[PDB]
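Example 526, ligand calcium ion.
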Amino acid sequence: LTPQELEAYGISDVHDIVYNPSYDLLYQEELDPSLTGYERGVLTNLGAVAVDTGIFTGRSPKDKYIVRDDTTRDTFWWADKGKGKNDNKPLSPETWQHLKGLVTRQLSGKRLFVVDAFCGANPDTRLSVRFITEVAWQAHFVKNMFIRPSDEELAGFKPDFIVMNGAKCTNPQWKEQGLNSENFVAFNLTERMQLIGGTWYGGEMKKGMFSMMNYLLPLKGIASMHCSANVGEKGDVAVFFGLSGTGKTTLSTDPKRRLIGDNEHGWDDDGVFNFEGGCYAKTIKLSKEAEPEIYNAIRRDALLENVTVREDGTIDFDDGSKTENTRVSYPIYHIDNIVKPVSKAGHATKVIFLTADAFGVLPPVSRLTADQTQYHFLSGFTAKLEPTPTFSACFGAAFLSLHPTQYAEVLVKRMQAAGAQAYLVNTGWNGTGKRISIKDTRAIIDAILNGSLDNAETFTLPMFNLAIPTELPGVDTKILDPRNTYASPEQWQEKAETLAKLFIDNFDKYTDTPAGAALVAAGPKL
Ligand SMILES: Nc1ncnc2c1ncn2[C@@H]1O[C@H](COP(=O)(O)OP(=O)(O)OP(=O)(O)O)[C@@H](O)[C@H]1O
Ligand SMILES: [Ca+2]
Ligand SMILES: [Mg+2]
């Protein structure tokens, strides 16, 4: 609020502070025709502002660093201490101070936007975050994606985390400091700050705080989950884990169910709760007949990123020539059917693992055993494209601050206490070399949530030993068995053996505990 207050963080000579801009103020700030470069917004015919995020159109895990100090040394899952790969690269406190002078100097003597907000729907576990930026649309991003405080909550607002966005500065000493590049996304848990240099991508702030929630919550016994969530009229809660592009936002935004959130949730003694106040949807080749809710949320106060807007202001949603990662964020009340005023609900009884399998091996749906649930949670499989595999522990290893086993343990405890069941859903590819359609996927989710799948007759799919139904109301029976989508079942066999090998090698790192070694029997077997 006052310059004396920003000076505590290291920023000086700030004349104009814009505290908690309203949506109307951000709209005017973004459309100021005097803006230059990547600060500029343009109005689209849908009424929503669109921006260009610059060189970076996604996260930069190679530039992510965590200060290694006595607070984090023995608790963090470090990239250099084994046994599993992750992006939590250690940083010295000395280099941290250098990066902090870079960002604070860049922000000094600027018009700064400051946004106070919450991460976490429950007062007992939420972080009070203070975001500092010089770009209006960046402030708009965090206004959309975090929980917007009431007037009364601003009154006594006490930040316990600061994120300073120094996107316009770069680090010229990076080669001497052993870093990946002149950009940086740095975290210091002793100071409780995130610094961002060089990249304008707003997702770094969203996932920065998620990584911070992923550090603190499981240490209190609370699951911290990379998943969307919604609840039926009968009060039944479902969560949908998955890696990028697998359908968390697409498939949780069903107007029969009340949306809880689309990306980040905790699970405590009272149930599943959203960390966020908005949604962040992929728009590449957006249909509108396939995703009407998401489409109609694109209006004033939504923020489009990197989409092509024509001279007449209309949007070419099919154009990925800047990036396939085109995006729109919006506050969650742009969705008509949501839980409100607080984004939370009871304990989940359906746990869905979304995966997009470019190898075309995995069945569209399968009810997992309790051990297959752990095996597939720790594996975190998806594949892209020709197919390249990704194994990302807990379906979100980019954001884990603790060891994967820690997340697995908390999830199992919550699931067992609630009597929850888990399901593996391939929203990716089959023998057709096409992605299964959203229509067919939505019907499969319906069969999961309404008990149809639990009461179906099943057989065991070989190799992966996954229980699959012979038929389901609403679904093409042909696709339920992935072997039928090839001309010869021997074609599937060949790819299943390839994929099973990748799973087996990947899981080996978990077999150094007796419990992990016993899970190998739940995995695929050659
Ligand atoms: N059968 C399907 N089920 C779900 N999504 C599908 C399907 N086929 C294609 N898609 C596309 O996949 C994308 C899913 O985007 P979505 O925002 O749901 O990703 P996400 O899982 O939330 O990941 P991110 O965290 O990157 O946003 C959309 O572009 C959607 O249209
Ligand atoms: Ca994601
Ligand atoms: Mg999404």
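Summary: Residues 489-507 form the longest helix (19 residues).
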